[PDB]
Amino acid sequence: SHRKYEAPRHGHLGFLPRKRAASIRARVKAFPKDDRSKPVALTSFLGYKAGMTTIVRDLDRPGSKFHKREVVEAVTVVDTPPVVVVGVVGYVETPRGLRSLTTVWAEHLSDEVKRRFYKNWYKSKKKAFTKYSAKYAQDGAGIERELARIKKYASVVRVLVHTQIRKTPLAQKKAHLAEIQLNGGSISEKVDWAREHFEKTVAVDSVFEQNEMIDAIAVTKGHGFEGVTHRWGTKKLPRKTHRGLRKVACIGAWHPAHVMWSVARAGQRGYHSRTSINHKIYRVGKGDDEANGATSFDRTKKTITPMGGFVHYGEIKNDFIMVKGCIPGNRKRIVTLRKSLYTNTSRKALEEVSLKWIDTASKFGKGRFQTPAEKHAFMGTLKKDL
RNA sequence: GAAAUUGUUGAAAGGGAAGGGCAUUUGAUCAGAC
RNA sequence: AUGGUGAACUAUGCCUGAAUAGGGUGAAGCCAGAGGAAACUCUGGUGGAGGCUCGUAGCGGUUCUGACGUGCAAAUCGAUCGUCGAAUUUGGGUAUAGGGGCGAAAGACUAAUCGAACCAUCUAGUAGCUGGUUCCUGCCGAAGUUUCCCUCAGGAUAGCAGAAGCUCGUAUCAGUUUUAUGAGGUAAAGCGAAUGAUUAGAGGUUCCGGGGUCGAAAUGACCUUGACCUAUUCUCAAACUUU
RNA sequence: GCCCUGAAAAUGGAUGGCGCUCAAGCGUGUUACCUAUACUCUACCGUCAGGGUUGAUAUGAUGCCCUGACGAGUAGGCAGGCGUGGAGGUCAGUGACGAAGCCUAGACCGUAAGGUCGGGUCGAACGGCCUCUAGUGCAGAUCUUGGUGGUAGUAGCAAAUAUUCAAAUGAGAACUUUGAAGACUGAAGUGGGGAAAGGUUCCACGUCAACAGCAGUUGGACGUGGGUUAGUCGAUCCUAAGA
RNA sequence: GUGAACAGCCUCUAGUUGAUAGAAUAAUGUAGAUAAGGGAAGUCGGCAAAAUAGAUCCGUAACUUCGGGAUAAGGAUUGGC
RNA sequence: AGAACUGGUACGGACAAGGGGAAUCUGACUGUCUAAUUAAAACAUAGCAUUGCGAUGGUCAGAAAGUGAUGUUGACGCAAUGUGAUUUCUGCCCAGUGCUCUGAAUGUCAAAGUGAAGAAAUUCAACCAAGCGCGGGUAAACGGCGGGAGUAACUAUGACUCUCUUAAGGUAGCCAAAUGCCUCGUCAUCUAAUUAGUGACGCGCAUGAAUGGAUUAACGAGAUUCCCACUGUCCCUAUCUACUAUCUAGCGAAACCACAGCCAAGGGAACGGGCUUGGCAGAAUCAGCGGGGAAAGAAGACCCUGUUGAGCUUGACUCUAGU
RNA sequence: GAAGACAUUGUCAGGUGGGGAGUUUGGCUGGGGCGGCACAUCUGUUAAACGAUAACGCAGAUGUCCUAAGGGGGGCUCAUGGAGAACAGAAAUCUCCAGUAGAACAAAAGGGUAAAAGCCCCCUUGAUUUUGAUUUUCAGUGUGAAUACAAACCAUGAAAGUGUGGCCUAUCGAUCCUUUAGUCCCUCGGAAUUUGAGGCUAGAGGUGCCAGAAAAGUUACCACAGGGAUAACUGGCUUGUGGCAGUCAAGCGUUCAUAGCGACAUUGCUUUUUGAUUCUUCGAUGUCGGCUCUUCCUAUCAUACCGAAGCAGAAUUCGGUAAGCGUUGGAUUGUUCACCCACUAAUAGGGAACGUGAGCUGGGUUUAGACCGUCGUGAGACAGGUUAGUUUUACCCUACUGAUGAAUGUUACCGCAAUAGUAAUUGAACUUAGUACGAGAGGAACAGUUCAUUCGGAUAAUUGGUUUUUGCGGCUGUCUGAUCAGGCAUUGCCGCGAAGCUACCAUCCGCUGGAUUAUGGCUGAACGCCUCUAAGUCAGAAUCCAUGCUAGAACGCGGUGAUUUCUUUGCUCCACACAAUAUAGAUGGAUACGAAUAAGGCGUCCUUGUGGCGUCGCUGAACCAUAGCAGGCUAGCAACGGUGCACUUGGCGGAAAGGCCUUGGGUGCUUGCUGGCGAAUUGCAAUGUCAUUUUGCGUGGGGAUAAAUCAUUUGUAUACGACUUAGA
Numbered sequence A: 001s002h003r004k005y006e007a008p009r010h011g012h013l014g015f016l017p018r019k020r021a022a023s024i025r026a027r028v029k030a031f032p033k034d035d036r037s038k039p040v041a042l043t044s045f046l047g048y049k050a051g052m053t054t055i056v057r058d059l060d061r062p063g064s065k066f067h068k069r070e071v072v073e074a075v076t077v078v079d080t081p082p083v084v085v086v087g088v089v090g091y092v093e094t095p096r097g098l099r100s101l102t103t104v105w106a107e108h109l110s111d112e113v114k115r116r117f118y119k120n121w122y123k124s125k126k127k128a129f130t131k132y133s134a135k136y137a138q139d140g141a142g143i144e145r146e147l148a149r150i151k152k153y154a155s156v157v158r159v160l161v162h163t164q165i166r167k168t169p170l171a172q173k174k175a176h177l178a179e180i181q182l183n184g185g186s187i188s189e190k191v192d193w194a195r196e197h198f199e200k201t202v203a204v205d206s207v208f209e210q211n212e213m214i215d216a217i218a219v220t221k222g223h224g225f226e227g228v229t230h231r232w233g234t235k236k237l238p239r240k241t242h243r244g245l246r247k248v249a250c251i252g253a254w255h256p257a258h259v260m261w262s263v264a265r266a267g268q269r270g271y272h273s274r275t276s277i278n279h280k281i282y283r284v285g286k287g288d289d290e291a292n293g294a295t296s297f298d299r300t301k302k303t304i305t306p307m308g309g310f311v312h313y314g315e316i317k318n319d320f321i322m323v324k325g326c327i328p329g330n331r332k333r334i335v336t337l338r339k340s341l342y343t344n345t346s347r348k349a350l351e352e353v354s355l356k357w358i359d360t361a362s363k364f365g366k367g368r369f370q371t372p373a374e375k376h377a378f379m380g381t382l383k384k385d386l
Numbered sequence B: 001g002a003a004a005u006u007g008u009u010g011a012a013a014g015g016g017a018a019g020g021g022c023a024u025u026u027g028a029u030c031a032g033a034c
Numbered sequence C: 001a002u003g004g005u006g007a008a009c010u011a012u013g014c015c016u017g018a019a020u021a022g023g024g025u026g027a028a029g030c031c032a033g034a035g036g037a038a039a040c041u042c043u044g045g046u047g048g049a050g051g052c053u054c055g056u057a058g059c060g061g062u063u064c065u066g067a068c069g070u071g072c073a074a075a076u077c078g079a080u081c082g083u084c085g086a087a088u089u090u091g092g093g094u095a096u097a098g099g100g101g102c103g104a105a106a107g108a109c110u111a112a113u114c115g116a117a118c119c120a121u122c123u124a125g126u127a128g129c130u131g132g133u134u135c136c137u138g139c140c141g142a143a144g145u146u147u148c149c150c151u152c153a154g155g156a157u158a159g160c161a162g163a164a165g166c167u168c169g170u171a172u173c174a175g176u177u178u179u180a181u182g183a184g185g186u187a188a189a190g191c192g193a194a195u196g197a198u199u200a201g202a203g204g205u206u207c208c209g210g211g212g213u214c215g216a217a218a219u220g221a222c223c224u225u226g227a228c229c230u231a232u233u234c235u236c237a238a239a240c241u242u243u
Numbered sequence D: 001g002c003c004c005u006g007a008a009a010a011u012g013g014a015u016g017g018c019g020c021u022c023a024a025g026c027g028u029g030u031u032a033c034c035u036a037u038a039c040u041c042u043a044c045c046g047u048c049a050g051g052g053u054u055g056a057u058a059u060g061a062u063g064c065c066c067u068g069a070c071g072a073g074u075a076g077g078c079a080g081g082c083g084u085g086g087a088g089g090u091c092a093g094u095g096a097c098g099a100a101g102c103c104u105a106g107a108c109c110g111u112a113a114g115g116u117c118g119g120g121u122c123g124a125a126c127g128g129c130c131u132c133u134a135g136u137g138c139a140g141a142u143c144u145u146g147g148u149g150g151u152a153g154u155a156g157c158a159a160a161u162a163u164u165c166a167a168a169u170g171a172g173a174a175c176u177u178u179g180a181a182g183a184c185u186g187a188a189g190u191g192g193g194g195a196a197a198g199g200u201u202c203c204a205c206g207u208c209a210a211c212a213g214c215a216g217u218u219g220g221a222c223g224u225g226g227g228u229u230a231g232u233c234g235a236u237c238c239u240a241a242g243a
Numbered sequence E: 001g002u003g004a005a006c007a008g009c010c011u012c013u014a015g016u017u018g019a020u021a022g023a024a025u026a027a028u029g030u031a032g033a034u035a036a037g038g039g040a041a042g043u044c045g046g047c048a049a050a051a052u053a054g055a056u057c058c059g060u061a062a063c064u065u066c067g068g069g070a071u072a073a074g075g076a077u078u079g080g081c
Numbered sequence F: 001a002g003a004a005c006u007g008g009u010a011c012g013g014a015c016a017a018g019g020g021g022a023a024u025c026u027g028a029c030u031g032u033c034u035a036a037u038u039a040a041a042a043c044a045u046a047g048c049a050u051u052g053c054g055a056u057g058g059u060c061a062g063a064a065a066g067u068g069a070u071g072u073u074g075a076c077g078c079a080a081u082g083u084g085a086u087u088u089c090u091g092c093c094c095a096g097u098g099c100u101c102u103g104a105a106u107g108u109c110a111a112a113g114u115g116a117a118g119a120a121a122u123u124c125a126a127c128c129a130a131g132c133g134c135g136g137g138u139a140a141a142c143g144g145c146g147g148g149a150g151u152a153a154c155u156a157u158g159a160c161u162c163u164c165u166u167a168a169g170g171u172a173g174c175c176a177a178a179u180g181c182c183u184c185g186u187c188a189u190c191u192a193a194u195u196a197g198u199g200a201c202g203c204g205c206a207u208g209a210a211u212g213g214a215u216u217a218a219c220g221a222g223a224u225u226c227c228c229a230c231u232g233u234c235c236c237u238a239u240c241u242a243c244u245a246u247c248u249a250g251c252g253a254a255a256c257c258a259c260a261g262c263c264a265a266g267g268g269a270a271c272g273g274g275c276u277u278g279g280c281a282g283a284a285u286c287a288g289c290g291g292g293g294a295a296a297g298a299a300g301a302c303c304c305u306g307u308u309g310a311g312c313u314u315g316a317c318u319c320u321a322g323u
Numbered sequence G: 001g002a003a004g005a006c007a008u009u010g011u012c013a014g015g016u017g018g019g020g021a022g023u024u025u026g027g028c029u030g031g032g033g034c035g036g037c038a039c040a041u042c043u044g045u046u047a048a049a050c051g052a053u054a055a056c057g058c059a060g061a062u063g064u065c066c067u068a069a070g071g072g073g074g075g076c077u078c079a080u081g082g083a084g085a086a087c088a089g090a091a092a093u094c095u096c097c098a099g100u101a102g103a104a105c106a107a108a109a110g111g112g113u114a115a116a117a118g119c120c121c122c123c124u125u126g127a128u129u130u131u132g133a134u135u136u137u138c139a140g141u142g143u144g145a146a147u148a149c150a151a152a153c154c155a156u157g158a159a160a161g162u163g164u165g166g167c168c169u170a171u172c173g174a175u176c177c178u179u180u181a182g183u184c185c186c187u188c189g190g191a192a193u194u195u196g197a198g199g200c201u202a203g204a205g206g207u208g209c210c211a212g213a214a215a216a217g218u219u220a221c222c223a224c225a226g227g228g229a230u231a232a233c234u235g236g237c238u239u240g241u242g243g244c245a246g247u248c249a250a251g252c253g254u255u256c257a258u259a260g261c262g263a264c265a266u267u268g269c270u271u272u273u274u275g276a277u278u279c280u281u282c283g284a285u286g287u288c289g290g291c292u293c294u295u296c297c298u299a300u301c302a303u304a305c306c307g308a309a310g311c312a313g314a315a316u317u318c319g320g321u322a323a324g325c326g327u328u329g330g331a332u333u334g335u336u337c338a339c340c341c342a343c344u345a346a347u348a349g350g351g352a353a354c355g356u357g358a359g360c361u362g363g364g365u366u367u368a369g370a371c372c373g374u375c376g377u378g379a380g381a382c383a384g385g386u387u388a389g390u391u392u393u394a395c396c397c398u399a400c401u402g403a404u405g406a407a408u409g410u411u412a413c414c415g416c417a418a419u420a421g422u423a424a425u426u427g428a429a430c431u432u433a434g435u436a437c438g439a440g441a442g443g444a445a446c447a448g449u450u451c452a453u454u455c456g457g458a459u460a461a462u463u464g465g466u467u468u469u470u471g472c473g474g475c476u477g478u479c480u481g482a483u484c485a486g487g488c489a490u491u492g493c494c495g496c497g498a499a500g501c502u503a504c505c506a507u508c509c510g511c512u513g514g515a516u517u518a519u520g521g522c523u524g525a526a527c528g529c530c531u532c533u534a535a536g537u538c539a540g541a542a543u544c545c546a547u548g549c550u551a552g553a554a555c556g557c558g559g560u561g562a563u564u565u566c567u568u569u570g571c572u573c574c575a576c577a578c579a580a581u582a583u584a585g586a587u588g589g590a591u592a593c594g595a596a597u598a599a600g601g602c603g604u605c606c607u608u609g610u611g612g613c614g615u616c617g618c619u620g621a622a623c624c625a626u627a628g629c630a631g632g633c634u635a636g637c638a639a640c641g642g643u644g645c646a647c648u649u650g651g652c653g654g655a656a657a658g659g660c661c662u663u664g665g666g667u668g669c670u671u672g673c674u675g676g677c678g679a680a681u682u683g684c685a686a687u688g689u690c691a692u693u694u695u696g697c698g699u700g701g702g703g704a705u706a707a708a709u710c711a712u713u714u715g716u717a718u719a720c721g722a723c724u725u726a727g728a
């Protein structure tokens, strides 16, 4: 017999299975479509989630109640030092999908990048690209052939970059390596662009520009094993239920004499890879720029880092991207920032966002002051002071 | 000093049972006859 | 059915013991005072009654239909709860014994056993009902049908089957055809044939159907309706039929 | 005539499936080819039937031989055989130079029941044949008694607030002893005595195979012993309900 | 000792420190709890839980077998010195 | 008992410790019972009422007895019943089934005893105890309280009158009550909305007087309705603690088990793990889970059958203790 | 003292006697009960032309009736119609004609019957006596009925003859007992007589459950052996009924059959009603409802796009593609159902063992307690009402959710993408616009903007919740002599309280291309016209497939880095040296345009094309290769070609290129032609061994000198594994 009353099902069936991701760095499964008319540019970037903070800005949209009037807003800061270009890969178009024809690497690789190729770095002769470096030191013999291989073939060209994880306060010491597809033109000069950028850093301002919609790709915060009530949002069973109430009462009919794949059940929650879209960049901060957190309306010399530092992350001495809202992943997590895959006017994505005030109060409590100078003025002199 | 049941060694087979029948290949072993 | 054993659990009586904070309320009896046309009424003390009451120990066992539910436990555990000075609680002694006890009465309890305890014997109690019923090969090979039965899940009986054969040796034979001779009432057919049913008009007769017209009426006449008769017409029958 | 509309049901799915469009569909016709335990021939087995052959030697005349036909089977009937315990007869049978039993993807016979042999183990009895006799053959009866698995190194060993440090002993210490620290019962006690009941559980010494669902050097365990002193405390006497 | 109290809580005498332990802190359980705004809409049903609660002062209805109802209902106070 | 002062308005500071109100049904109350699914409206109870009996007795026990209980008793008692405090009331019916009384009896009637016939066994006849039958009493015995006809000046109805069955015809009260089918009865009230609730209306299938009727303060771990307060019951969930579950050392079971364990459809004992046609199909596994294994727990307690029972009842059949 | 031969005591007899005892309280049967009798029977039919033949199949009948309605005989002819007669008519009685039964013969019906079998008159008991045979049913038993006889005694009639009950087919009863008639016989057993009794043959009393016990209920306190031979769930066959849908078109609709409806008929579908049945299940598949959750169907309520109107607008009605997406909060009731209140775009219908009880609950139903009404004498009964009433077990397999993991030389990093899944949804306000339209009333829509509902995925800056941060403070009781500082009160209590977790109770985000359905069109035949259709084709829906999003096949794949010698000489590549290993199956060559097939291939020519001319196919049965000891050893001739082999020059090919072409020289052979030598004996065939897979051990010649795991450690992770970090 039918349900006596209707209700939408709990949870989304397109995000199945709710298993753990295969890696801590979510993979980019689609890059922006290429038109061979623009200059050569990276389409993505690698950064670390620093934390949340609060922004005040003047909303500008006609027809709204809050037009030309203040709105307090929530943003998240992603810490983005420049990425070092080491290597390039060509992809031939085959009837069985794209396939990497060959990889050409740079002559010199730092320590922090070659640590990626090791499980035990403290036990090593460290033997990394030692015989590959001998491919260089010739005039024009070796490297140019595989480079010309990517010229003659490989309709898709991607660039291997590694993050400067030593500049961030993270205690990892082991960089993150990824392919970022080049979406310039004339794949021959895509290969040329990667050639003279070997061992050279690409800053975030050359990829993302302020007031842009970008994509955040990261692995979500994990919560271990979860009951069905929280994992799927099912209704809680009544109080006087024998043998538990954080369950699903009927997990199937008599026929088919099986449990279907679509019935909510207990298991892993979180640590999924997600691609959230349409996040607007509110600031492209400069690492070597005092008063990162300042604004034309504030004009007070203060960096983006709140008093006491970003909770569980540290400080933002490097460049950063301030993007509106919330993104998948927790603090200290590697996050990939991707360009929008389509063009949207939307009367909301073309708005020019000009900040007015950035919150720098402590996130380690009910923060009261924005700067140590502000705290000293309000309170006065203390007994600690001499 | 049996069987169920068990250990060790040896041999063989095993993609959601195993076991069986006809026929033969292959491997192991063997009687007769000269 | 016979003969025994149990009131160490529990039921009720009797005998002899034993146990039961601290509060609330404030009955009779008693003292003093006040108002008083008397009569009498009122007030404050005192006192400490009640199968009274809140609530411990105790005795109990309402709800969570909680825990447990191959338990700690063949009835327990937690919380909540009833009663708590007596128709109270309880020990020991003793009385009551199975168609019998005891019962503030639930068919309750009478040793985890009760709408008739337990033990042994009669007793291998009876069952048209359930289950099982042990080696091989060869040859043959059924029935669910008849009649009777308090007969319908059973028997008896005939039949179907096997075995032993017996007397004879191709015949007093045959789940067949032919010839000759009978019997039958089904299929079909039939209703201008009996019975019954059933459509339509045509022609006739009323001293004797009902009506309208000319008539006082006529066994007077005219038009119509009903039956009646004749020759037709359409359609039928398991309990209709010549064939 | 074919095709289409008419033509709506619940897990995904059924010309058997793939798939097939002058078909690999439908109607129709003509040949070729495939294959049943069916039909023809042959061999072999048994059963039934009809016959031949005592003649001397050689023993089964219930024997040997010739001919023909036939063979499914539940319940059931009949017949011929295999095996077991024991008894009469006989093989002047086998055997401590190894009987019986047990084990053996080694050999042989029989359609089969079964029979025989070889090898290992073992240690004292046992068979062939003709007969006699029966407590004579198992896969099952929620069969009886005994034994053993998968489950499975699994459920579990979570009520009662709580342990820690060090030394001693020992093969071995979370658990024994001692010290120290931290706690609890909180006087209707986790204290000190008894009644009923138990019977040595009391105490010492030695001691850990078993029991204390971990452990164990410890124990209400195990082995060996010691220990209960009345004129006054009880019984002993009286009587009660009763016997 | 607190306190009306052989209540509940703490301590003295006396006696125990007995119940397999160790490591982590997933889901779901058992037991104990707290929740913004709403306040029975939940459910057969307020089942469960919550609220009230000691004492002192004030005040106390219908009805009544005149004994009760009654701690009715409803207010105030509460430490230390 | 009172007064100052004092504090982050706190102070029965932990512990301890009534939620309250308006109503309906029902039992008066306290008390008792189904040990181990029912604590109740059940039982008890006081009070009320009835019945039997003066001892050669009532009631009861016993195989029997020179036997017993009440009884060491004596109607202000003993035995047997019904109802169930108080208040109020307990209406009509003795035809029936009972029970109980007169016996004034051509009714019936045993054994014995008597008479006649007989040759006797025997047959016949009259007579005849208790009992039945006949005739009275009794309902706080068991119980019952129905039709019909004619009538009042609008109809309707019947204060009045008569009549059968079979004796009487339901009075005082109470009711969609725990007793009403129809029924979710109709009206009012309560709600935004009520098959609930309360108050009313009645030819009431089938209310009703110690089968007790009605009312009723107090009480109730009894059934029900609503209001205030209060809250995680809920909107709609979230978080925390202990012990588990989890991993380890030691110790270490049970249920159950034809063989086993992937589906779809088909056909099939009409719902397959196995069969057919398909889809498929990769070792070894861990924590969860409750779809399935028509999972497990019991030779269905329901139904039916059986010439199988038992407990109980009675104008069943056949007997019997006692009297 | 009382009583007194009465009580009492003993035996026999009558009444009373559920206090007690034992027992019984039919059968068939579309389950049982109620009902009925299909139980003993009879007629017609079913019944299918001998006989037989079932059903609780159809129309009925019997437990009797008759001294004549039995037996014999004689005479007459019936029902009815027509015509006539005083009262007298449709029915009185009388006359004639007609009249095959259309009457009667007890009853039920069917046969039969006309000088009778009918109606009237006469006589009588043949409805008698004796035992046998036979038919029916059948067992060739009994019982009943009957048939024809034999031996007596009669009736009637002139006589022939008829008469052994009823014109035929129903109309009935064993054993034991009692009783009667007959025989007046046998026996009473030590011998007699007489009563009495027992025997012998024929009747009567009766069993209707009728081949034949002597028999009341109840059980909700219950028991046993069984039954799925038999009911109450599901499921299966069926579909009357329920529900849904068609065809026809008399009519309604002012007018007008079909805008919307639609009578009388009729044809279907479904299994969400209820029936009918009894196949499975009674050594048990847990029978209401709700809650929870998933999925499926379409007969579509809303949302998308459309067609038709009795569509001016608005609102609405009919219909199509469509199940992508939604379909609620409540009062009462256990309720399913129902009925109201209210919101909403809408509050559609259903299935999944009437889904879902080792998921819950337990309000209802349906054990045992209890009350009432009604019924019963009673025990008790009631699909009447009411109140209280134990809801057990997963640790196994599979499924599902998550999680590891051997083996693909090792190890590490970066990737591809087969397959599977998928997602967004709906409303409001402003403007368009008081506009279009309409006499007026009234009154839209596309485009645009701002928000909101339902859903989903994350996240913690802020706000709120949570407190063992037992972090700070405060307070009570007690304990530590007081102070300070602490313990205990199972987290003592209270206020605040960071971090983490977390709330539509907080915030953010949720994409655009193609192909289509219905539908509306273009060109254009069929059908000289016309037509959206046939060929061809355009636009088009919340639809499908893509983009995008999640996982990554643990037996799908690519690129890249490093690859161990003093673990006692290890690893890799190259040449041969010998072994082992195995074969989804060499035995001359897998021999390369593309495109069309109502058209092409090749050759040639020009003015280079969609060109002209010529030729070819009609199968690869082709082309190439192919002679020599399983293919030997030598000689010459002719040309300077052919082939194999190791080197070498230069290119081309990345879809899995791993192969193709080419320059130069050397070398072997050459069957292009002509000579010389050898073969035997494997005995007359025996595959008669000539291929390539992998691995190992040796040489000699180059090439290069790593990691991973455990353990420790971090928390961006976590049940354990696993993950992510760090450590010379």
Ligand SMILES: [Mg+2]
Binding pocket: C037
């Ligand atoms: Mg005066």
